[PDB]
Amino acid sequence: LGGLERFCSPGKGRGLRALQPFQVGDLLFSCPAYAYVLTVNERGNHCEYCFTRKEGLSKCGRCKQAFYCNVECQKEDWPMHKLECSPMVVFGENWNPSETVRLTARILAKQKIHPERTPSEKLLAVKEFESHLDKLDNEKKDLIQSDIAALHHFYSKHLEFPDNDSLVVLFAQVNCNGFTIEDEELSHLGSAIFPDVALMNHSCCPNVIVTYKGTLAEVRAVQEIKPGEEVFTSYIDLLYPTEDRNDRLRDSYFFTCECQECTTKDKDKAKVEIRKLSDPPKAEAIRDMVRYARNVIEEFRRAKHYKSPSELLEICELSQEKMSSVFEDSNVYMLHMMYQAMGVCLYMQDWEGALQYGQKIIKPYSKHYPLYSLNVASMWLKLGRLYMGLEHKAAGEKALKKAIAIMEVAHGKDHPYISEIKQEIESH
Numbered sequence: 001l002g003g004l005e006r007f008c009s010p011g012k013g014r015g016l017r018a019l020q021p022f023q024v025g026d027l028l029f030s031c032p033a034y035a036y037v038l039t040v041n042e043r044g045n046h047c048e049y050c051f052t053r054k055e056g057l058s059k060c061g062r063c064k065q066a067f068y069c070n071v072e073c074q075k076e077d078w079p080m081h082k083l084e085c086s087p088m089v090v091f092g093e094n095w096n097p098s099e100t101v102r103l104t105a106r107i108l109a110k111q112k113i114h115p116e117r118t119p120s121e122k123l124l125a126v127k128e129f130e131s132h133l134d135k136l137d138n139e140k141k142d143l144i145q146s147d148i149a150a151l152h153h154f155y156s157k158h159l160e161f162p163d164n165d166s167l168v169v170l171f172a173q174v175n176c177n178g179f180t181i182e183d184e185e186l187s188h189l190g191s192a193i194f195p196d197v198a199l200m201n202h203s204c205c206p207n208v209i210v211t212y213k214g215t216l217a218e219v220r221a222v223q224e225i226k227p228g229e230e231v232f233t234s235y236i237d238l239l240y241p242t243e244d245r246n247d248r249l250r251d252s253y254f255f256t257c258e259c260q261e262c263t264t265k266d267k268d269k270a271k272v273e274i275r276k277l278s279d280p281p282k283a284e285a286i287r288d289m290v291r292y293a294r295n296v297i298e299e300f301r302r303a304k305h306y307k308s309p310s311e312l313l314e315i316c317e318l319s320q321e322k323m324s325s326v327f328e329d330s331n332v333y334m335l336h337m338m339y340q341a342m343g344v345c346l347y348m349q350d351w352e353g354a355l356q357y358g359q360k361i362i363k364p365y366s367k368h369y370p371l372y373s374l375n376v377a378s379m380w381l382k383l384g385r386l387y388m389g390l391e392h393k394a395a396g397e398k399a400l401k402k403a404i405a406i407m408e409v410a411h412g413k414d415h416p417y418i419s420e421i422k423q424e425i426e427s428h
């Protein structure tokens with residue numbers, strides 16, 4: 001709470017303000033999760049209650065699909081696991097609510113259980129969340145209804161559903177204020193709601209970073225903050241040019257960024273770096289390849305749900321072949337396809353393929369992103385772990401050290417993830 005304040009940020013609604021100075025790597029505040037969910041694919045790898053990544057995980061006898069550190073965690077998570085335990089077994093293979101429906105069901109359960117202001121709502125309350133209901137078109141309003149139907153379909157037993165479709169308000173609120181809990185390699189662990197953290201506005205030049213210590217959100221300065229200065233995070237991936245960033249912010253958050261980077265368009269020429277080839281491309285040759293680039297990102301986005309790894313790798317190489325003609329290999333659109341391919345090799349357990357892609361990525365990655373970037377820290381981590389795994393321990397230790405350098409600021413020097421990497425350098 002201390003040394004910070006809620007205020008009306010002009011043309012940004014409510015926001016967070018500093019009342020004291022903050023230095024690079026300082027914890028402004030922590031926020032316990034108000035409501036949270038462990039992602040289906042991480043069940044058994046982490047405790048459902050505290051999110052501890054351990055090996056001696058005790059399975060829920062009643063459903064065989066919830067794992068905990070012990071019985072104390074099992075007991076504590078029951079008021080929330082109660083919502084899914086029996087349904088999972090009764091519906092079996094037919095149990096498929098989206099993580100949004102899963103999280104929203106828990107928000108409804110927390111309101112029944114704890115109607116009072118929670119210690120997660122010191123400055124902002126879930127009830128007070130911005131919905132953007134008024135800007136929702138007929139397509140978006142319909143998607144919320146598909147999700148309201150699922151909430152009724154699967155969580156009808158223990159929940160008393162509110163008013164009309166003032167559930168449309170709750171779903172829109174989660175869509176606009178919800179959080180994704182990622183791991184040290186930026187892999188999806190789950191979804192949560194953090195009220196006080198949701199008060200911070202967006203900047204493509206963030207002065208803070210949100211990291212997670214179990215289910216607790218921690219906010220640390222990645223730039224020096226002086227009194228009266230507004231505290232800003234990044235809502236989106238900062239690799240992309242101004243237009244791309246702004247299309248994402250408009251679609252998901254109903255606003256346009258007017259920050260230094262968006263006003264100036266500084267990193268745009270380097271991000272979409274054109275080959276300095278004998279006879280230039282032409283204005284329309286760039287614009288046609290950028291239209292092709294965006295299309296292939298989205299085509300791969302779709303494809304990955306239904307194509308084989310080799311089919312998926314072919315898309316990467318053939319996209320990079322067509323674009324190679326116009327675009328430099330440092331070009332963000334080239335980097336995207338290389339990252340995707342690295343991801344495919346990792347899945348196939350092709351460690352050399354993944355390492356040979358990661359090396360091509362890291363240098364332009366560091367350049368296109370800010371100084372302390374989780375995107376670059378995790379890329380150093382994947383590289384260090386690929387090196388260490390393949391027995392190239394010199395290069396592994398250097399890449400792992402590079403990761404730790406960023407993490408000491410973003411995660412804090414005393415973070416479990418950092419003690420884990422240090423123990424990776426000690427043994428192997």
Ligand SMILES: C[S@@+](CC[C@H](N)C(=O)[O-])C[C@H]1O[C@@H](n2cnc3c(N)ncnc32)[C@H](O)[C@@H]1O
Pocket residue numbers: 011012013014015129130176177198199200201202203252253254255256257258
């Ligand atoms: C997670 S909330 C942040 C707190 C918020 N302004 C409020 O008072 O509820 C997200 C919403 O805040 C606004 N917002 C965040 N960053 C912004 C920015 N840089 N410029 C304009 N509006 C912004 C948009 O309405 C966005 O959808």
Ligand SMILES: [Zn+2]
Pocket residue numbers: 047048049050051052068069070073
């Ligand atoms: Zn636990």
Ligand SMILES: [Zn+2]
Pocket residue numbers: 060061062063064065066081085086
């Ligand atoms: Zn169970």
Ligand SMILES: [Zn+2]
Pocket residue numbers: 203204205257258259260261262
């Ligand atoms: Zn911006």
